[PDB]
Amino acid sequence: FSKSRTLVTVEAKPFTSRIWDDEQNFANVLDCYAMYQVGERRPDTAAVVKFNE
Amino acid sequence: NTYRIDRLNTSSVKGRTSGVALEPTPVRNDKMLIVVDTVLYIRNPIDYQDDWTAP
């Protein structure tokens, strides 16, 4: 594929690691979340090769 | 949580002639209460994803 025009990575929340103290439960729980979606703009620029054993 | 306001009654005029005893009359009273016991509320939770994908 092309490394500039074959793929796109739409991001609404980038990578984020966050530590919040739980008080009701004794816990310094650590969250680590990220929301995104990848789509293939211009699939004509990709060339996969299937391998039939 | 309570609140008190006292109340009071009234006496009545009565007649008398010569040698007649003056009948004593009570003046009743009471109290009134207002008690707060309910919490009005609005609870609107917005999820993170909807926050991250909407103004």
Side-chain angles (χ1 to χ4, degrees), chain A residues 1-20 22 24-52, chain B residues 1-22 24-55:
Chain A
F1 50 92
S2 160
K3 73 170 65 49
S4 56
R5 67 191 223 171
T6 318
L7 270 173
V8 74
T9 307
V10 176
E11 263 160 10
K13 184 61 162 186
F15 194 53
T16 294
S17 298
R18 184 261 305 272
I19 320 180
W20 51 279
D22 216 357
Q24 184 178 2
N25 301 113
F26 288 168
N28 273 17
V29 64
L30 157 68
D31 291 331
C32 195
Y33 45 89
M35 191 185 58
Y36 73 74
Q37 183 62 255
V38 60
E40 193 193 340
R41 155 185 68 161
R42 297 208 69 120
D44 50 351
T45 300
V48 303
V49 171
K50 185 177 180 180
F51 289 89
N52 313 321
Chain B
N1 69 336
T2 76
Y3 187 80
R4 253 197 81 182
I5 294 146
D6 269 26
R7 292 167 164 164
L8 195 51
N9 212 20
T10 70
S11 58
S12 309
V13 166
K14 308 207 242 175
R16 173 189 166 273
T17 304
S18 82
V20 172
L22 292 83
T25 181
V27 184
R28 308 299 191 203
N29 48 359
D30 207 350
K31 70 160 164 60
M32 82 164 264
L33 263 69
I34 311 170
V35 179
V36 286
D37 45 10
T38 315
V39 191
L40 273 55
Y41 68 90
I42 296 282
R43 171 61 81 81
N44 294 334
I46 315 167
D47 202 74
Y48 280 11
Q49 327 181 31
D50 306 338
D51 183 10
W52 301 336
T53 56

